[PDB]
Design a protein around this ligand. Structure first.
Ligand SMILES: CCCCCCCC/C=C\CCCCCCCC(=O)O[C@@H](COC(=O)CCCCCCCCCCCCCCC)COP(=O)([O-])OCC[N+](C)(C)C
Ligand SMILES: CCCCCCCC/C=C\CCCCCCCC(=O)O[C@@H](COC(=O)CCCCCCCCCCCCCCC)COP(=O)([O-])OCC[N+](C)(C)C
Ligand SMILES: CCCCCCCC/C=C\CCCCCCCC(=O)O[C@@H](COC(=O)CCCCCCCCCCCCCCC)COP(=O)([O-])OCC[N+](C)(C)C
Ligand SMILES: CCCCCCCC/C=C\CCCCCCCC(=O)O[C@@H](COC(=O)CCCCCCCCCCCCCCC)COP(=O)([O-])OCC[N+](C)(C)C
Ligand SMILES: CCCCCCCC/C=C\CCCCCCCC(=O)O[C@@H](COC(=O)CCCCCCCCCCCCCCC)COP(=O)([O-])OCC[N+](C)(C)C
Ligand SMILES: CCCCCCCC/C=C\CCCCCCCC(=O)O[C@@H](COC(=O)CCCCCCCCCCCCCCC)COP(=O)([O-])OCC[N+](C)(C)C
Ligand SMILES: CCCCCCCC/C=C\CCCCCCCC(=O)O[C@@H](COC(=O)CCCCCCCCCCCCCCC)COP(=O)([O-])OCC[N+](C)(C)C
Ligand SMILES: CCCCCCCC/C=C\CCCCCCCC(=O)O[C@@H](COC(=O)CCCCCCCCCCCCCCC)COP(=O)([O-])OCC[N+](C)(C)C
Ligand SMILES: CCCCCCCC/C=C\CCCCCCCC(=O)O[C@@H](COC(=O)CCCCCCCCCCCCCCC)COP(=O)([O-])OCC[N+](C)(C)C
Ligand SMILES: CCCCCCCC/C=C\CCCCCCCC(=O)O[C@@H](COC(=O)CCCCCCCCCCCCCCC)COP(=O)([O-])OCC[N+](C)(C)C
Ligand SMILES: CCOc1ccc(-c2nc3ccc(-c4nc5ccc(N6CCN(C)CC6)cc5[nH]4)cc3[nH]2)cc1
Ligand SMILES: Nc1ncnc2c1ncn2[C@@H]1O[C@H](COP(=O)(O)OP(=O)(O)OP(=O)(O)O)[C@@H](O)[C@H]1O
Ligand SMILES: Nc1ncnc2c1ncn2[C@@H]1O[C@H](COP(=O)(O)OP(=O)(O)OP(=O)(O)O)[C@@H](O)[C@H]1O
Ligand SMILES: [Mg+2]
Lengths: 664, 571
């Protein structure tokens, strides 16, 4: 596998949305980067149009300017009509504009002595009579260019709004692709969780399972947002900007393309150092939090033993280390990031000045101030996202590891393939055939456990701690497989029926009643969606006193949102019992190894049991060996092996382990 | 910004570094305003006939000089500023832990552990960020913005500047509004994601119940429904989050367009030059960053303020609950004598101890028994200075307990609380905790005295392994007893410390402790009345008052309270 391959595979779903967003982004990028090109055409053609040659023309001619008594028209606007000799000019010397009503051979260093214009290009070309264009007269050489300027400005505004609309569209659709990919991934992971062995959950803290389901998926969401919004966006943006640069000028575009390696190397080095500094900051900050936590919870021993000086000293060691690494990170972020950005911008200004000043000194009339302005704007646009790019590049690793975690969870091979409930009742019978159960390997926890239970209920299974009673419970529900022997429910091997089919018969009541957040009715019903108003089944358990105590537990009250802590432990057990009765199972199992008694609540619990055991095969792993006084068949477990097998009276008539326990 | 006023101590304490940073920042602004105008001047001088290789070389050299100056001075000033922020973080963290270490249990009753962690892990971040980044953003927003505005207005024009600047205030306002709405919707999305986490916790914690009732499909249905809800919330977030880039692009392109077109027109009127126009654009291209900064500034300052209050709310306004007073020259504890003491807890409306008066002499051993909730531990809480004085009088020798300095008192006592409590360090370190790493030869003696040696040889050496972060109720109790005993205390208080070990083990522990400590007092509290048999004083507590003061024989001959009679009641 690989997390990149898996992420691409999950993106291929919603590839359609991704393509939509990318095309919208390309439209926006083009309709954006075209803006600076309008300015290049609003300067080189309109403002610097006066710099182009003029020819004499008649007054009737359109776009012809009357300087003194002669109408002149630009060469570019000249077109077919009035194509003749006797050209004019409007040169620029210092801050003044000078008319040359005559042809000029070359161009170069322009000087005006007195009504004269001497242009030198290293050979003192010639001198020509010059007139001054004042302010009004020069403006008249500009008035023809006002309308094209208006058109270009309107084009700029329109393309701005159009590109803006498509920018919003592309960003929204990229976010939609990311969120939908993440939602699908979460659904897949949780579904894969429901098909995992109870071994996985037993050998792994819940907070880690919840973490891998949700927090790592949120990390994947952050990674997708990063990639789509930063890397792809900026890559296409840079591609467009370089296209525009090569449209404007090729050599300067190459000089600009000489910064892609700059970005790559900046990213490499900044990551190389920032990963280390950030990992140290993270570990030391976690250590500081752990220290503060343990000192807060435990301070009575920090003070009762006068360990305050030493704990403060250790905390200060961690604080000094944290401060030192923060300052190292600051030094890195100062040698790099916005400072290097500005330095590169100024190097860009230097390169522009060098290139254009040299081109001018060549005296080839290739100044093209519009090209320079567009290049300045394009470089300013190009430099904008570098800092974000390097930050994301450095931060990618956390998302990489989170993705690895979630994908390892997804790609587990050992899973349970089931989901077929039971379509007929069990009738309540179960048998064991020397089932040899070993949790990990070799070490057996239930050796040759062989017993048979009939429709008669109240089958007690007692013994010392760590004897195998909960292992029996696990084997009954197929949470684990006995890997030997067989268990037959109503004569049918449990290994030959779907786990859902099996569990459709047997209810469970445990020491810690799981009260899922919700209503009391939803707690009894487990939001099964099939349980009608059958909460009277709770009234069978004799809860009745409590529904009167509380508002309306029958699907209208919600005192379980707090995990039922406000409710008594007896009430929690009674709710679990009500759930068991409401689901109306056939092979009930009771794991009540709780050594505690929960004074007098046992009383109602006993009553509750008296209303459920009827018409089932009630296994009871309750303690005190007193609730099981009348149980149809007791069974003492020790060493993972049934040693004494008989009724209460029979066992008490043979001494042994059961008699010993009874006395205690 | 009240945060900076409230933070005056840091700035007065560190004034030179901040003056250096501010001065260098103003200088950096000034020398960064030059390169744009120089580029404009190069363009202008180019169009005019006067331009030679010397001018080109001058411009290149000056640009290199200004680049180097800006880089170096930027490194220095922002090293100073952000180092000031880091120093503020460090100062606040050390101050916070120092304040914590001086606090009594009542403070933790009033302050939850999460809230203290919330402060020390988020308000410190907010205040340090104020200190450095908020200062940077304030100075930018205020001086950098006006500097660029004035450079535009004077060295380019006041007609282009005012015109091509209208979009930027609107952009800043819109960005602030978007920040507000996105923060709100982000909080909503985080609420939904937390609900999803809660549900995914229940369905992994209650896996067996779900599977035992074949409900592992409705569980997926609910999970899908809430994942859809989380997606919808993220979508509401993205709807307003996608308005940032469009608005910035629109309102910056509008400014660029106004500059370009209106400057073309101004050139037509001879009021402006080509180079100037280029310069103008560059200025605008460096006036967008301030706009964002404005918003950020406000944000951080407000957070800073609030955060700081919370810090100061639980860093200064909480004074010590107990303190020394006028050290009395009492070297070693004498005879503890309670005189009608009474002790109502801060969170109790009942007395919790009523006219309790009993006496203990040197070398004597005391046994406290009684029903659960009968102030058994409360009594010794009156001997550890963990709460306000109470009433009556506890006087070692003749001096009241208040007069003894806290340090000397806590040096006398050796305390073993009923609640098992060990730190994440090694077992050997936990034992040395009594003397704070003075010597190790006595560790073997302490282990032997508590009979932990048998329980010490069944785990790997591993520096006596580790506890807390990485193993039995009896073992924990025995290590706590060894830790308390390592102090060689003149007063050793065991509080139900052997409830986990067997009767044989606890009896042997009590016998050995009493034998080794002959001339020193020893309080024993236990529900198991067989551990106080040999004590020469026993008083049973029932609520606030005593009931059965006397020796073991006296109490046996007085009334039957548990004792051996009810030892086999359950057997
Ligand atoms: C006219 C018929 C062309 C032939 C049909 C091939 C179509 C492409 C022709 C392209 C030329 C052939 C080379 C590429 C082949 C596909 C490789 C790939 O994985 O790209 C994927 C781009 O994923 C997307 O859906 C867009 C994002 C598409 O493939 P897939 O969805 O990942 O599976
Ligand atoms: C220069 C001037 C313009 C130039 C135009 C430049 C590009 C213009 C692009 C188009 C304009 C953008 C319109 C956005 C529409 C809403 C978003 C959306 O479609 O996502 C929906 C996903 O549903 C899908 O599956 C998306 C693709 C469905 C197309 C039909 C599939 C056929 C294969 C075609 C495969 C290729 C897919 C390509 C589809 C275009 C869900 O959204 P919602 O929940 O309903 O809300
Ligand atoms: C998608 C592309 C759409 C482009 C179309 C425009 C889109 C809108 C952009 C409008 C943005 C604002 C442009 C202002 C132009 C300068 C005005 C001084 C006949 C004589 C001129 C009439 C007056 C001419 C009035 C100015 C408008 C004439 C075209
Ligand atoms: C990821 C990060 C990327 C960073 C590195 C990107 C470097 C890529 C950048 C290299 C790309 C070079 C493109 C050169 C095109 C212009 C030449 O001259 O002057 C002019 C006269 C008008 C000609 C217009 C038509 C030219 C072809 C346009 C072609 C239009 C463009 C075709 C592509 C558009 C999809
Ligand atoms: C992965 C791909 C990334 C993007 C690479 C391409 C980057 C290209 C960079 C974009 C720079 C473009 C400069 C154009 C300036 C025109 C000025 C003018 O009036 O000249 C007279 C010519 O008259 C025309 O015909 C102009 C036609 C519009 C050209 C621009 C295309 C985009 C328009 C908007 C349509 C939506 C955008 C469609 C995409 C371009
Ligand atoms: C110092 C070097 C400067 C000297 C070059 C002088 C003229 C080169 C001609 C040229 O490249 O024209 C291209 C300019 O637009 C482009 O497309 C550039 C071609 C390279 C694309 C960028 C990758 C360069 C990596 C390496 C256009 O032609 P075409 O698109 O390649 O067809
Ligand atoms: C628009 C402003 C850009 C903004 C950024 C500002 C500055 C960016 C950095 C400064 C820019 C420096 C560019 C490096 C090329 C040499 C320079 C040179 O003298 O040209 C000559 C080289 O003629 C060639 O064609 C050589 C081909 C070299 C290809 C490999 C590039 C070397 C850098 C690999 C990449 C390493 C990464 C670092 C890049 C160096 C021209 O020869 P001629 O005789 O005149 O005809
Ligand atoms: C005529 C003479 C012209 C001179 C003026 C024009 C020059 C422009 C003047 C400004 C100075 C330009 C700064 C370049 C160095 C950046 C520092 C840096 O990257 O720090 C890294 C060092 O390692 C490196 O240096 C990597 C270089 C990345 C490129 C980080 O190291 P760390 O923090 O220890 O982790
Ligand atoms: C100072 C401002 C100066 C700077 C100006 C620039 C500031 C711009 C910053 C804007 C901040 C973000 C607020 C936008 C709200 C939004 O996006 O969707 C929300 C509602 O969606 C609607 O707004 C539609 C309801 C009104 C439709 C009729 C519009 C005119 C009415 C109003 C006329 C204005 C009345 C105002 C006076 C009371 C909900 O989002 P959802 O997810 O879709 O559900
Ligand atoms: C986009 C470009 C928007 C402006 C285009 C028109 C500017 C040129 C212009 O009309 O000059 C006129 C308005 O000159 C002014 O001073 C009006 C203010 C121009 C900026 C308006 C945008 C502000 C947002 C002045 O022309 P006149 O002949 O000097 O009288
Ligand atoms: C046009 C030519 O010149 C340009 C001028 C500006 C930009 C530009 N492009 C941008 C892209 C993104 C952002 C941006 N990145 C952000 C990250 C976080 C936030 N937040 C988080 C949510 N809340 C709290 C508000 C602040 C806003 C953010 N805004 C700014 C941007 N500015 C591009 C060209
Ligand atoms: N998931 C598991 N993997 C391996 N061994 C386990 C696992 N769960 C329990 N064990 C151990 O297997 C043995 C069987 O004990 P079991 O879980 O059946 O409890 P029990 O004897 O009924 O305990 P209790 O005193 O709580 O009633 C014990 O050593 C128990 O610690
Ligand atoms: N932190 C507290 N805040 C308020 N009241 C308290 C607190 N701790 C104890 N109490 C009160 O003290 C009563 C009992 O005090 P304490 O727990 O010290 O003695 P005990 O229960 O007899 O013995 P032990 O602590 O050995 O079980 C409790 O019922 C409660 O009323
Ligand atoms: Mg059990």
């Amino acid at each position: 596998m690989k997390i990149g391959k898996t992420l691409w595979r999950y993106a291929l779903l919603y590839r359609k949305l991704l393509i939509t967003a990318v095309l919208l982004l390309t439209v926006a990028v083009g309709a954006e980067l075209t803006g600076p090109f309008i300015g290049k055409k609003m300067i080189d053609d309109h403002i610097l149009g006066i710099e182009k040659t003029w020819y004499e023309a008649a007054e009737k001619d359109k776009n012809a300017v009357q300087f003194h008594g002669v109408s002149y028209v630009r060469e570019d606007r000249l077109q077919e009509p009035v194509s003749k000799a006797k050209e004019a000019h409007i040169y620029q010397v210092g801050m003044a504009f000078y008319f040359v009503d005559q042809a000029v051979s070359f161009d170069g260093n322009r000087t005006v002595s007195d009504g004269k214009l001497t242009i030198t290009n290293g050979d003192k070309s010639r001198a020509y009579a010059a007139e001054k264009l004042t302010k009004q007269e020069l403006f008249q050489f500009y008035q023809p260019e006002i309308k094209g300027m208006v058109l270009l400005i309107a084009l700029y505004g329109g393309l701005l709004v159009f590109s803006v609309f498509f920018q919003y569209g592309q960003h929204y659709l990229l976010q939609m692709s990311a969120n939908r990919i993440i939602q699908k991934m979460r659904q897949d992971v949780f579904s894969h969780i429901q098909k995992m062995p109870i071994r996985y959950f037993d050998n792994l803290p819940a907070g880690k399972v919840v973490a891998r389901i949700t927090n790592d998926t949120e990390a994947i969401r952050d990674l997708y947002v990063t990639v789509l919004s930063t890397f792809v966006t900026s890559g296409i943006y840079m591609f467009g900007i370089f296209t525009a640069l090569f449209l404007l000028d090729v050599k300067l575009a190459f000089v600009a393309l000489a910064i892609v390696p700059i970005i790559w190397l900046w990213s490499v080095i900044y990551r190389r150092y920032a990963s280390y500094y950030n990992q140290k900051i993270r570990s030391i900050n976690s250590d500081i939090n752990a220290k503060m936590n343990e000192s807060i919870q435990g301070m009575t021993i920090i003070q009762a033993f006068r360990h305050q000086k030493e704990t403060m000293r250790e905390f200060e060691e961690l604080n000094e280390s944290h401060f030192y690494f923060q300052n190292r990170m600051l030094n890195l972020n100062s040698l790099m990031s916005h400072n290097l950005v500005n330095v590169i911008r100024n190097l860009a200004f230097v390169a522009l000045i060098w290139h254009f000043g040299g081109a001018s000194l060549n005296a080839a009339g290739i100044v093209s101030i519009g090209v320079l302005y567009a290049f300045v704007d394009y470089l300013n646009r190009l430099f904008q996202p570098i800092t974000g790019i390097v930050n994301q590049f450095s931060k990618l690793e956390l998302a990489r590891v989170s993705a690895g975690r979630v994908f390892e969870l997804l790609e587990e091979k050992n899973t349970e393939e089931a989901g077929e409930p039971a379509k007929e009742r069990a009738l309540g019978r179960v048998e064991f055939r020397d089932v040899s159960f070993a949790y990990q390997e070799g070490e057996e926890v239930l050796k040759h456990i062989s017993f048979t239970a009939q429709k008669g209920e109240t089958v007690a299974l007692v013994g010392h701690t760590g004897s195998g009673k909960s292992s029996i419970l696990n084997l009954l529900f197929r949470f684990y497989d006995a890997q030997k022997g067989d268990v037959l429910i109503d004569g049918k091997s449990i290994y030959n029926m779907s786990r859902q089919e099996l569990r459709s018969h047997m209810g469970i009541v445990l020491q810690d009643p799981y009260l899922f957040s919700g209503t009391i009715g939803s707690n009894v019903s487990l939001d099964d969606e099939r349980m009608t108003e059958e909460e009277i089944k709770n009234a069978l358990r004799q809860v009745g006193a409590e529904p009167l105590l509380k508002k309306l537990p029958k699907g209208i009250n919600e005192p379980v949102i707090e995990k039922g802590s406000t409710l008594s432990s007896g009430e929690r057990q009674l709710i679990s019992f009500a759930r068991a009765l409401a689901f109306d199972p056939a092979i009930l199992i009771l794991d009540q190894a709780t050594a505690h008694i929960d004074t007098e609540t046992e009383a109602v619990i006993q009553k509750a049991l008296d209303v459920v055991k009827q018409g089932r095969t009630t296994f009871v792993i309750a303690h005190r060996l007193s609730t099981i006084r009348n149980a149809d068949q007791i069974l003492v477990l020790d060493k993972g092996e049934i040693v004494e097998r008989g009724n209460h009276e029979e066992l008490m008539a043979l001494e042994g382990q059961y008699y010993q326990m009874y006395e205690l | 910004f009240s945060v900076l006023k409230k933070l005056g101590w840091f700035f007065k304490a560190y004034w030179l570094r901040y003056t250096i940073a501010i001065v260098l920042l103003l200088a950096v602004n000034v020398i960064e305003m030059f390169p744009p105008k120089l580029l404009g001047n190069a363009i202008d001088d180019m169009k005019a006939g006067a331009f030679t290789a010397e001018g080109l070389l001058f411009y290149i050299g000056i640009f290199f000089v200004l680049t180097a100056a800006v880089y170096i001075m930027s490194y220095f000033w922002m090293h100073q500023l952000f180092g000031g922020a880091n120093l503020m973080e460090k100062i606040l963290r050390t101050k916070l832990m120092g304040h914590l270490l001086t606090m009594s249990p009542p403070f933790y009753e009033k302050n939850r552990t999460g809230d203290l962690m919330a402060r020390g892990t988020n308000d410190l971040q907010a205040v340090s960020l104020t200190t450095g980044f908020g200062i940077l953003t304030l100075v930018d927003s205020t001086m950098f913005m006006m500097t660029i505005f004035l450079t535009m207005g004077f060295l380019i024009s006041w007609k282009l500047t005012f015109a091509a600047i209208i979009p930027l205030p609107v952009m800043a306002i819109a960005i602030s509004l978007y920040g507000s709405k996105i923060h709100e919707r982000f909080t909503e999305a985080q609420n939904a994601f937390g609900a999803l986490n809660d549900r995914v916790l229940e369905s992994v914690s209650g896996v067996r119940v779900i599977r035992a009732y074949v409900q592992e499909t409705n569980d997926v249905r609910r999970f899908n429904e809430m994942t859809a809800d989380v997606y919808q919330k993220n979508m509401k977030v993205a709807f307003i989050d996608s308005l940032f880039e469009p608005t910035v692009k629109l309102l910056v392109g509008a400014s660029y367009l106004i500059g370009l077109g209106y400057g073309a027109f101004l050139v037509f009127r001879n009021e402006l030059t080509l180079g100037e126009l280029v310069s103008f654009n560059v200025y605008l291209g460096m006036m967008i960053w301030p706009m964002f900064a404005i918003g950020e500034l406000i944000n951080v300052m407000q957070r800073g303020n609030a955060s700081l209050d919370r810090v100061n709310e639980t860093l200064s306004y909480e004074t010590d609950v107990t303190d020394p007073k006028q050290p009395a020259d009492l070297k070693e504890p004498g005879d503890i004598v309670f005189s009608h003491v009474s002790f109502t807890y801060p969170s109790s409306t009942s007395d919790n101890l009523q006219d309790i008066s009993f006496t203990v002499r040197k070398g004597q051993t005391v046994g406290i028994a009684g029903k659960t909730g009968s102030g058994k531990t409360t009594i010794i809480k009156q001997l550890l200075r963990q709460y306000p004085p109470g009433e009556g009088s506890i006087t070692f020798s003749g001096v009241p307990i208040q007069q003894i300095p806290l340090d000397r008192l806590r040096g006398w006592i050796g305390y073993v609380p009923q609640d098992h409590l060990l730190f994440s360090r090694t077992v050997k370190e936990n034992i040395l905790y009594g003397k704070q790493d003075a010597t190790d030869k006595e560790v073997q003696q302490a282990i032997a005295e508590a009979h932990f040696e048998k329980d010490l040889h069944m785990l790997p050496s591993g520096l006596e392994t580790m506890v807390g972060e990485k193993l039995s109720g009896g073992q924990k109790q025995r290590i706590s007893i060894a830790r308390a005993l390592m102090a060689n205390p003149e007063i050793l208080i065991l509080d139900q410390s052997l409830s986990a070990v067997d009767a044989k083990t606890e009896a042997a522990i009590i016998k050995n402790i009493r034998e080794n400590r002959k001339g020193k007092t020893t309080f024993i509290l236990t529900h198991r009345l067989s551990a106080v048999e040999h004590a020469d004083l026993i008083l049973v507590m029932d609520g606030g008052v005593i009931a059965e003061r006397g020796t073991h024989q006296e109490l046996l001959a007085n009334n039957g309270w548990y004792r051996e009679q009810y030892e086999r009641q359950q057997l």
